[PDB]
Amino acid sequence: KKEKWGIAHIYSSFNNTIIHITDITGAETISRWSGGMVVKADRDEPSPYAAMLAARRAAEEALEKGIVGVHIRVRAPGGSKSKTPGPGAQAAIRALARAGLKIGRVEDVTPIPHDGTRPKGGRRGRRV
RNA sequence: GCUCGCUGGGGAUACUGCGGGCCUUGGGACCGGGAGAGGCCGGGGGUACCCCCGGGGUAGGGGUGAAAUCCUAUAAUCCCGGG
Numbered sequence: 001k002k003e004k005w006g007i008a009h010i011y012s013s014f015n016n017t018i019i020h021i022t023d024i025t026g027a028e029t030i031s032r033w034s035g036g037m038v039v040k041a042d043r044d045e046p047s048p049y050a051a052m053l054a055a056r057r058a059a060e061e062a063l064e065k066g067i068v069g070v071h072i073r074v075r076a077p078g079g080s081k082s083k084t085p086g087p088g089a090q091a092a093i094r095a096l097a098r099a100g101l102k103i104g105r106v107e108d109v110t111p112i113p114h115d116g117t118r119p120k121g122g123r124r125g126r127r128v
Numbered sequence: 129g130c131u132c133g134c135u136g137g138g139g140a141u142a143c144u145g146c147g148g149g150c151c152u153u154g155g156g157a158c159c160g161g162g163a164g165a166g167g168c169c170g171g172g173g174g175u176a177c178c179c180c181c182g183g184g185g186u187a188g189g190g191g192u193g194a195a196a197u198c199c200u201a202u203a204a205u206c207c208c209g210g211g
Contacts, residue, residue: 042192
């Protein structure tokens with residue numbers, strides 16, 4: 001059908017957001033923009049605003065190179081770390097929609113352990 | 129009356145003790161269909177995490193209330209194929 005589709009991996013955490021566009025197989029990188037290379041202050045990196053700014057740029061290269069459709073794979077750190085995606089996920093998805101890209105299947109691929117390793121912080125956790 | 133008692137004899141067998149006899153209620157033994165993360169031994173798996181190699185890809189990654197240390201151009205973070 002000679003139509004260009006790809007996959008947008010959205011690493012969302014409580015400190016940073018990374019948007020990475022690759023081909024259908026994921027073996028070739030088309031664009032990769034993080035939340036830290038679009039804003040200066042460290043506090044703004046996890047902000048939903050920085051996420052959408054990064055997504056706009058990341059989508060620009062995809063449009064230029066010919067990608068028209070994208071399947072979104074949002075993921076939190078997972079494993080022994082936090083599982084809930086950070087705030088900069090819905091913002092990134094909406095920014096990708098707004099930039100003029102068709103959005104296909106949306107799935108969460110956070111790595112869930114089947115009672116794997118020991119989380120950091122000891123038995124008493126963080127005593128902030 | 130007291131010396132908290134000792135001793136010579138006679139009488140009773142309700143209770144305790146002792147010897148004997150007969151019972152199943154307590155507790156054990158055994159058969160029947162089932163329940164259970166009860167133990168030990170052998171075989172087979174689950175994702176996740178860490179390291180290494182091969183491909184893509186550039187400049188940040190990580191972390192905090194905010195930062196810094198730390199990793200990163202000897203190609204980091206991230207995605208993919210393998211051990």
